[PDB]
Symmetry: none
Subunit: 229 residues, 4 copies
Amino acid sequence: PVERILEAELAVEPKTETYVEANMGLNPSSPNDPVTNICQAADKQLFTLVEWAKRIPHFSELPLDDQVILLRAGWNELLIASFSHRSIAVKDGILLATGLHVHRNSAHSAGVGAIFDRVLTELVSKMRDMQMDKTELGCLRAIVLFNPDSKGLSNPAEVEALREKVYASLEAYCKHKYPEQPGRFAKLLLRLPALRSIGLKCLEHLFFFKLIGDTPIDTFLMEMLEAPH
Amino acid sequence: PVERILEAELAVEPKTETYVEANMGLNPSSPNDPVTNICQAADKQLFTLVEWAKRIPHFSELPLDDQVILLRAGWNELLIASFSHRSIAVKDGILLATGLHVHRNSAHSAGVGAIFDRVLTELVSKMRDMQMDKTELGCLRAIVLFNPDSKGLSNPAEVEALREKVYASLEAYCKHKYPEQPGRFAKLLLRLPALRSIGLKCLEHLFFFKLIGDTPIDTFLMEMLEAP
Amino acid sequence: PVERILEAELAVEPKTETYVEANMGLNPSSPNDPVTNICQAADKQLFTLVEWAKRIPHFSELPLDDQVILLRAGWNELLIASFSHRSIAVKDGILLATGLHVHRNSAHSAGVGAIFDRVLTELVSKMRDMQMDKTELGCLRAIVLFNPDSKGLSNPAEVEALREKVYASLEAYCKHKYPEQPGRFAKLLLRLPALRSIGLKCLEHLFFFKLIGDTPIDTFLMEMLE
Amino acid sequence: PVERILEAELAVEPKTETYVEANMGLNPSSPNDPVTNICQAADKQLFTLVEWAKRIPHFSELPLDDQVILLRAGWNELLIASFSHRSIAVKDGILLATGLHVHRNSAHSAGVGAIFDRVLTELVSKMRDMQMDKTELGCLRAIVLFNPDSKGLSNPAEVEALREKVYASLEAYCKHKYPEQPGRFAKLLLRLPALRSIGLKCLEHLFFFKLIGDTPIDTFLMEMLEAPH
């Protein structure tokens, strides 16, 4: 339950060295080729997401096609929830997995300032105000993952049952850990609608593409444009 | 107090005649004019909605500017939650205030079939299976109304405080009305994201406008350039 | 005849009373019911667009259903081309047909300032810098009305021909009235792409609805909540 | 030189070895990991797009930033215009590499049959019936590239002037090649609105991506899920 979901969060997402461009990236790879480079980044990021989902109790016991369904259904929300929580530490933009700080101005220059500000006000500041811990973020994500509304599921009910085991545990965790905050559980769950709407706006705006591709592309462009004809 | 909110939903709880007048045709307004009809409603729904919110404990105690900003940020989801709960008594269809019925066939023909089915499977069907009652519906809508993420409001904190009062009361209501089902509170709260996304999709794809159909457009459009 | 299109332009022109009847209430308005008032305004504006198209040469000679198609296909861009040209008189906002002047920051109302800014820079500001007259505007609108790409048309070629006649007149006019601007014609035509994209944005953000509705609605709401 | 435009257009058009080889499968890359194909094909496309733009008179004499801006603002319409013109060769379809490609069925099963209809109807067919040659096409793309409305440009009027030079030459070209068609010039310019809207629709619905299908997506995820837990 709770302890295995918090271990899932901690397992794939940290290492004081990774937040300094892992696999050497900071000192390796060195941005040069456009689309392939960014496609590799996305691949790396999604995979981390999968390794995490696989550590969620019972996720792997589900039919393979359902696991795929759930992943296509919640990947964007799962991602935004992770970097939003990670960002409570700063009051500017957002911190990425590599510990890199994406400042507010970068996103307004990229043309996604409005959606970026929603992330900041509706998720980051809200998470900061209630000091949402990793156990709690982990549970919300597991809840998002087990989305029984996903289309094509061979057995929505089983997914619904997995969802309830997680939230029944989130509530027990909260009441036991923060008894002085009787409405905390509801509060955590009530950040889900915001995540839902911001999630959709990020897709229509190609938010993730710009986040990992805009720089690599500008660099390649300015490089090729000034290069010898 | 929510039976003053449930009374707010009962002080407008679609009577009897209103349903037999449209679910038959024994209503005036002569169904000859289309524009006149669809607009009579909406204005009526907007009216009921405002009276509803005014009955919500503490709503009127917020600054005026904050009240309208809350009503216009939530009118869409508030309306959707209502006709979804009301359609529980129908299969693969939706019931509006006047007893007007719209079947999923119309939605698909009009191009908004996917969203219409999300309402049926993510909202209606779910409300049906857990037998969500009117009190709980009243609390979810009030929670929706007290949206602290709303842009431009002068005091998000005050709004989220009123929001907490409502969900805390709802939780109490669930624990005592349905003690045998410990996860009912969370379940109710977990329908909210569906409501959020369905709402955005309904706005994006002009849900309501499209349900009207195109023939009523071509009709008086042909009328303007085919006068006599 | 480029004048027959310029005449249809002035007749249906936003007149005077049409602006004083709405930007006032000189028409049993004073405003009471919100949504109904908004639909009436729409109906009103839509109708004038229909009176205009009928005065455009040959439009009424096209099969009824195709006419409807062309109308549904272009109403959005026709209204925008209209208020954008009319907005040339003002300095930082868009002047509507109902006489109502909607400013920038005031319009933005934390909702649709982005596409509102596009109308100013891409359309309004451009029409001013080149000072396109009503005749040129009228022709551009006829060209937009006669859109041969409209889905469903029974006879595209015929609409295409109607379109050609119009821009052939517009080109002639331009070379005659602005002899020093060889490229004025193409410059007029190169505004249509912007018109196209803005038209689509104005549909996903209910630009019109909000533009002629947030006031009646905020009024209503304020009385109700009192 | 309107030739420097057409020459720029001809020196970038796909050969006959990329149309034949891919047609039967005489090309490398070995279709086994169709994750590389789209990225590599993307890199290739972006590369040749820049080469082409640099060959457009006066483009490089523009500010670096403005050069980047215009390319980012138009790459989309620029690509659509090329394949649409390339599709004149295929019977009621779109061309990409492998022999005669996509037809309405694929587009239909992919859920983008309607925008496919627009592409054939508003671009391909129209280009065919009036026989738009490669010189007119090059000029159209250049006009598109020199988009004065692009956001961020340091000096819009400069770009507007470069656009005027291009269309003035296109008009001269039309007058000479088709004297009997006085309205040809206007006709060519009037295809731009279609390009504009079709371009937006292709972006918003990710036309090409969907055309490839969602089975490769399910497969690539499946691969992640089957990775050593």
